[PDB]
Amino acid sequence: MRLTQGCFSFLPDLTDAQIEKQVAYAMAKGWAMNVEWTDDPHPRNNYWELWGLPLFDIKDPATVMFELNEARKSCAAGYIRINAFDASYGVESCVMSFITNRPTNEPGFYLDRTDGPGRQIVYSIKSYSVQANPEGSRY
Amino acid sequence: MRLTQGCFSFLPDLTDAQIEKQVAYAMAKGWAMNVEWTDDPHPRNNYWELWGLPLFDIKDPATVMFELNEARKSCAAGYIRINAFDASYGVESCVMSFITNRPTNEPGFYLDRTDGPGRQIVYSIKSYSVQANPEGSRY
Amino acid sequence: QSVSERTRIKSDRYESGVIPYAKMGYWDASYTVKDTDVLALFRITPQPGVDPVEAAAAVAGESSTATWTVVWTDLLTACERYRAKAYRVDPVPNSADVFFAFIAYECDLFEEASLANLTASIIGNVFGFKAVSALRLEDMRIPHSYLXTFQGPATGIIVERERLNKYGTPLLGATVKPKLGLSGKNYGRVVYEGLKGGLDFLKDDENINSQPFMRWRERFLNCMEGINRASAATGEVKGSYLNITAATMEEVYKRAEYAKAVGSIVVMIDLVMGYTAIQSIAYWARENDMLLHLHRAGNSTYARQKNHGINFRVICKWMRMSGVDHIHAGTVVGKLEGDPLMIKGFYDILRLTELEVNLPFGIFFEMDWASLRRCMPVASGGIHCGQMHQLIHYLGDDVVLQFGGGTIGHPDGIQAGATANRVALESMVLARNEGVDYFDQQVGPQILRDAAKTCGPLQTALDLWKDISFDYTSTDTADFAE
Amino acid sequence: QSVSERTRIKSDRYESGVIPYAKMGYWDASYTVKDTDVLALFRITPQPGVDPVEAAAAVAGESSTATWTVVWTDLLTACERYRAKAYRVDPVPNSADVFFAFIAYECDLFEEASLANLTASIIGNVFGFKAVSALRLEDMRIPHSYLXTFQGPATGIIVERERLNKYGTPLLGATVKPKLGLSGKNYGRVVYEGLKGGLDFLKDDENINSQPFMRWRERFLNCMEGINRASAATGEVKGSYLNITAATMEEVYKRAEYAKAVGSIVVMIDLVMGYTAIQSIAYWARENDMLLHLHRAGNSTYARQKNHGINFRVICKWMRMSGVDHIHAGTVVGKLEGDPLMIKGFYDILRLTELEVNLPFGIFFEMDWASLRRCMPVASGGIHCGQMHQLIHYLGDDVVLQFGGGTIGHPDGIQAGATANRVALESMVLARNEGVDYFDQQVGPQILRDAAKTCGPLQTALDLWKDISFDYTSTDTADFAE
Ligand SMILES: O=C(O)[C@@](O)(COP(=O)(O)O)[C@H](O)[C@H](O)COP(=O)(O)O
Ligand SMILES: O=C(O)[C@@](O)(COP(=O)(O)O)[C@H](O)[C@H](O)COP(=O)(O)O
Ligand SMILES: [Mg+2]
Ligand SMILES: [Mg+2]
C-alpha cells in the first residue's frame, strides 16, 4: 500500500527538482522549512524525528535540498517529509507537509477490533512494519 | 415601636424645616425627588404607593414639600417617605430615602416560626396592623 | 387639581405623546464611534413620503430603547447612554429610494456571550416595521470587547489541520447520496468507499437525522467501521460529519455523546437548530475534542434577496462568534447562489485575523477578530473536478471542497470518483505553487487533461461533466464592482 | 559536518547564549500602548551595578515570554507579538536609586476570566529575581476587553442597597468580640443585641470558621434566630456576615449553601482562601442571590511596605474584577495602616465607573471599569463614634463603617453600643447635608456633643473614647503631594 499522508501523495513521488520548486514557493512566502523522519507510519504519529533545527534564516532553496540529501544518506529506511511552518499571527502552524521519501515495501495496517459495550467496537490501527521490528530496522 | 426604615429614623421625627433641608440637598445634587405612602410596614415591602410621578423637571424644594403636604392630607393613616432618585450611569437608583410621617402608634411585628428540616426554622415576619385590617384602615 | 395631573411631565421631550424617532435622540450626524460600540449597517427602503433620516432613527430606536410614544420611565435610566445612534446615511449607489444607514449601539446593551441577545435587539422587530418597505442587515462591527466574551471556533482552522495531519492543499469531502432512504449499513458502505478512494471526509445530508428508513445509532456505528477501515487502508486520519441535529437539546447531546464515545473526529449540526442550541453544542465541542461542522440550512430564506433580510456575511460573523468550526459559504461555480465578490468577502470574514474596509467584497466595517479562531469555509453544491482550477483561485487554501454528486455520480464507482477529485486537486495545487497561471481558461483545463492522462478516473470525470456549468444571474450582488 | 552544527542558528538574536533582556525585545521606549493591552506599573529597586532599564526589561521578559538564555523555540510562535514591552522607566521622587517602570502586555497572554492566570504572569516570579533588590506592583490598567470577561461584583453597591432598603447614609456594622471563644448560642445573642440596637450588620471575625468552642452550624442557626428577631423588632432588613471560610472548596460551598437555605442575606470569606476559591464563590454568590463580603486576611503581608510587594489598590482592582461585594479598604483614623490619600485612592478604585490619573491618590493609570458593578468598601478596625466626622469626610457615602470594640465595649451594653454609633452617624450626615462645615476640628466634635445631649448611649461613648487616637507615621505613603 501507499501511505497517503502528506499533501501531494496522490501524485507520483516528487523529484529533487519538483521538491526544490515547492521549497522555492514556501521560501518566497516567508515560511520556515524543516525535514523530519519516521518509520512509524501510524496516522496518529504526530511527532516524526527532527533532522536538525528548522531552517529559519535561509535565503536559498539549495540549502533545504542539501539538508534533505544529507538526511536521506544518514537515516534508516522509512519516511521523510518536508514541512513549511508559518510563524505569522493567526497561523503559528505547519502550512505545508509532503512526503519526500517512502520505503519500497509498505505493508500498511490492519484494523484491530475489541468488543465494547453492546455493539460498540474499540478500534486500534496496527502497523505491520512497527509490530515486527524496532525503530531503525522496520523497512 | 418605632419603624427604623429610612436613613434618619434613629433621630427624632424630622420637622418640616429639617425635611426641606434634606430635599434641598438632594435637589442641589440634581436628584429626582418622589413621595410615597404605605400602611404595610413590612421590611420586604419594596413598593410603597406612588404619590404621583417622581418630580423630574422640578427645581423648587417648596414644590416638593407641597406634594409631601398634599400626600399628608389625602392619604390614610400610615407612613410616608421621601426618596431621591439619581439617574446617572453608575447609580441608576435611589440614593436617599427617609420617613416623613409615621403613625401615632405602630404595634410592630412578631416573628412566626415554622418547623423546617432538622433544627431549621422557617421564619415569617407578621405586621399586626396588616393582619388585622385592610389597606386604608390599618392605623 | 389631582396629584397625577400636578406631577405630569411638561418638558418638550417627556411630555406625553408621539414625537419622531429623530427628535428622540436616536439620530446624530456627528456621533463619534467608540471602539466598544456595536455598529450595524442597514439597507433601508423607506415607504413613499417617509424621510430617510427618520426611518434610520426609527430603526436605531426600536432596536435599542424607544417605542412609538414617549415614556416617562426613560428618566429612571441613563437614557442618553442606552440610546442607539443612527450616525450616517448615504444613498445606495444607483438608486434614490434606498439608503445605507450606519447605527451604533452602546456595549452595555448586550448580554455577554449571547448571540440570542445580540440578534434580539438587532433583528427582533425592525424588519417588520410599517414605515419601512424593506430592510436588510448588510454588515456589523462586533467590537473587540464583546468578542472576548465569546469562545469563537471550538477547534478552528489551525488545530483542525493538526488533528487531521493535513497541510498544504484544501481539504476534501462529499455528501452521501441519495439524500434520504439509505440504511445505516449502506451509509457505512458509501463512507468507506469514498474515504478509501481519497476523500478526507464524507457527511450526512442536512436532512439525515433519524428516520424510519435509518435510525441514527445504526448510521453512526456503521460509519465508524467504515471510517476506521478507510484509515487502516490509507494511514490517514479520516472522518464523516455525523449529523447530531435533533428536535430537543437533550437528543442533540445524546447524539453528540454517542459520536464522541465511538471515536468520531467530527459532527454536524444544521442552522435550523437555531442560535441557542448552536452556542450550546459549540461549547460542548470545545470541551469534548470535537470538530463542529455547521450546515447552513435555512439561510437563503433571509439571505437571498438584496432588498431585504440578513446578508450571509453577518451570519458568518455570528457563527464564528458562537464557535462552529466549519460553515458552508458557497462555491461561485456550483448549483447554489454565489457571486465571486460576495463569496470572497464571506471567506475573508471566516478566515482573517482582522478586516480592512473593502466595499467590492461587501466588507463595510473594519474589524479586529480579537484572536478568536478561524472558521473553515466549506464549498459545496453541484461542483466537479473539471472546475478545480476555478475552485483553487476563487476559494484559496483553507477550505473544504465537497463533491457529493461529483464523487458518487462517477460511472466507475465511488472510489474512482474520490480519486479523480484528489488527483485533480493535488495537481492543481502542485501547479499553482510552481508558478503556473492555473486560472487562465486554457491552462487550467489543460493541467487537468494532463493529470487525466495518468489517472483513469479523472479522464472519465472530465469526459462526463466538462460541459456542466450553472451560468445564471446573481440575486446577492455587490453595490461596488471590481 | 553534523546536522546540529549546520542548522545551528547564527543570527544576533537567536544564536545560543545569554544576551541582555533589553536586547531581546523587552524594552521599547516608543511602544504605542494599545487599548487592549494590560498595563502594569512596578516600583523597581535594582541591585547596585544593574541598569534600571535592563531591570525593567528583565521584569517584562520574565513575566511574559523570556528566560535567562536565548531559545530557538520563540521562532515557532509569533514571538514579537507576545513579548511584554517595558515602555517607560522614570526616576522616583526623593529616592535616588528607585524607579517606576511601566510595562505593556498583549491581551492574548491572559486566560479569559482568570485572576489566577493574570497574577501568574504579573507576580509569579519577578519578585524573587536576584538582579532586583526590591519590586512592588503599584497599579494596573486592566483593559475594557479583559474586564468584560469577568463577572464584577455579584451584587454591587446599587443592588445591595436595594436588598437592604437603605439609602442616604453609610451602612453600619461590627465584628463580634472576643474574636475567638464564643459558643453558637452566645454568638447569636451578641448578633441579636447589636442588630436590635441599630447596626445593619454584624460579622463573624475572620478567624471564626468552625472550631472546638463553636462548630459552624451552631453559629449559623442561632445567628439567624437573632437576625430575624432583630428584623422583627425594628422592621428593617438585617443580616450578619456568616463566615464560610474553609479548608476545601467542598466545605466552603457546604457552608454557603447552608447559609442560603437558612435565609442569610450575606456571607463572608477571608482572602487567605485564595483567588480561585474566591472567583468560585463570587460566581456562586451571583447564582444564589447572596451578598459576598471579603475580609482581606493576609493582605498586609505584602501590601504594607513602600519598597516591595503589591500595593492594595491593585488588590482592589483584582477583587472587584473577581466579584466580591464588600472589601475592607481602610479607616484612616482607626488602628490599622491607612494614609488618607492612599485610602481615598482605594475607595475611588472600588466605587467609580472609571478612573482619571490622580497621582496624589496613587492612581497611575486612567481606566474604564467596563460597567462592572461597584464594590462597597468597608471601614473597620479601631474606630469609634467620636471620629464619625472624620469617617464621613475621608470615606464618603457608600461604605460600611465597622465598630466591633466600639459597639461591644460600651459599658451600658451592646444595644447601647449600637445605638450610640447609629445616632452619631445619622446626626453627622444630617448635618453634612444641611451645609455644616462638619470636618473642622471644632464643629465635628460639636455636632456629636449636641446629639449626645439627647442620647445617653452616645454621651457615654464620647466620654469613654474621645481622647483615643492611633497617630503613627504611615509606611504606605504617596510619592506626589495634593
Ligand atoms: O444537499 C446538497 O445539495 C448538498 O449536499 C450538496 O450535494 P452535492 O455536493 O451532491 O451537490 C449540500 O448540502 C449543499 O451544497 C449545501 O449548500 P450550501 O453549500 O450553499 O450551504
Ligand atoms: O479583627 C479585627 O480587628 C476587626 O474585626 C476589627 O474589630 P474592631 O472594630 O473591634 O477593632 C477587623 O477584621 C479589622 O478591622 C480588619 O482590618 P482591615 O479592615 O484593615 O482589614
Ligand atoms: Mg446536503
Ligand atoms: Mg476581624
PDB file of C-alpha atoms in Angstrom, chain B residues 50-57 66-67 70 85-89 92-93, chain C residues 3-4 6-11 14 72 75-79 81-82 108:
ATOM      1  CA  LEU B  50     -46.504  56.457  44.447  1.00  0.00           C
ATOM      2  CA  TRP B  51     -47.771  59.925  45.260  1.00  0.00           C
ATOM      3  CA  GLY B  52     -47.951  60.888  41.565  1.00  0.00           C
ATOM      4  CA  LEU B  53     -44.863  60.738  39.378  1.00  0.00           C
ATOM      5  CA  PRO B  54     -41.315  61.500  40.552  1.00  0.00           C
ATOM      6  CA  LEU B  55     -40.868  65.255  40.229  1.00  0.00           C
ATOM      7  CA  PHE B  56     -38.328  65.248  37.422  1.00  0.00           C
ATOM      8  CA  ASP B  57     -38.476  68.841  35.997  1.00  0.00           C
ATOM      9  CA  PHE B  66     -46.212  70.929  48.855  1.00  0.00           C
ATOM     10  CA  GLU B  67     -46.664  67.401  47.419  1.00  0.00           C
ATOM     11  CA  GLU B  70     -50.827  67.083  49.957  1.00  0.00           C
ATOM     12  CA  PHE B  85     -33.540  59.185  42.580  1.00  0.00           C
ATOM     13  CA  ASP B  86     -30.093  59.558  40.832  1.00  0.00           C
ATOM     14  CA  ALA B  87     -30.362  58.583  37.126  1.00  0.00           C
ATOM     15  CA  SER B  88     -26.589  58.623  36.406  1.00  0.00           C
ATOM     16  CA  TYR B  89     -24.613  55.809  34.856  1.00  0.00           C
ATOM     17  CA  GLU B  92     -29.474  54.481  38.334  1.00  0.00           C
ATOM     18  CA  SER B  93     -31.170  54.060  41.693  1.00  0.00           C
TER      19      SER B  93
ATOM     20  CA  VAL C   3     -51.890  64.635  42.039  1.00  0.00           C
ATOM     21  CA  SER C   4     -51.418  62.683  38.739  1.00  0.00           C
ATOM     22  CA  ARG C   6     -49.902  68.260  39.033  1.00  0.00           C
ATOM     23  CA  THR C   7     -46.925  65.896  38.535  1.00  0.00           C
ATOM     24  CA  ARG C   8     -47.354  65.381  34.707  1.00  0.00           C
ATOM     25  CA  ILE C   9     -44.107  65.810  32.829  1.00  0.00           C
ATOM     26  CA  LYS C  10     -44.282  69.070  30.830  1.00  0.00           C
ATOM     27  CA  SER C  11     -40.825  69.126  29.078  1.00  0.00           C
ATOM     28  CA  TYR C  14     -41.025  63.663  28.052  1.00  0.00           C
ATOM     29  CA  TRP C  72     -41.517  58.989  31.492  1.00  0.00           C
ATOM     30  CA  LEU C  75     -35.819  59.071  33.187  1.00  0.00           C
ATOM     31  CA  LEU C  76     -35.310  56.209  35.682  1.00  0.00           C
ATOM     32  CA  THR C  77     -32.320  55.233  33.465  1.00  0.00           C
ATOM     33  CA  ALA C  78     -29.214  56.841  31.987  1.00  0.00           C
ATOM     34  CA  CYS C  79     -31.170  57.195  28.765  1.00  0.00           C
ATOM     35  CA  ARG C  81     -26.225  56.384  27.219  1.00  0.00           C
ATOM     36  CA  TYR C  82     -28.516  53.488  26.156  1.00  0.00           C
ATOM     37  CA  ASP C 108     -23.686  47.567  27.737  1.00  0.00           C
TER      38      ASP C 108
END
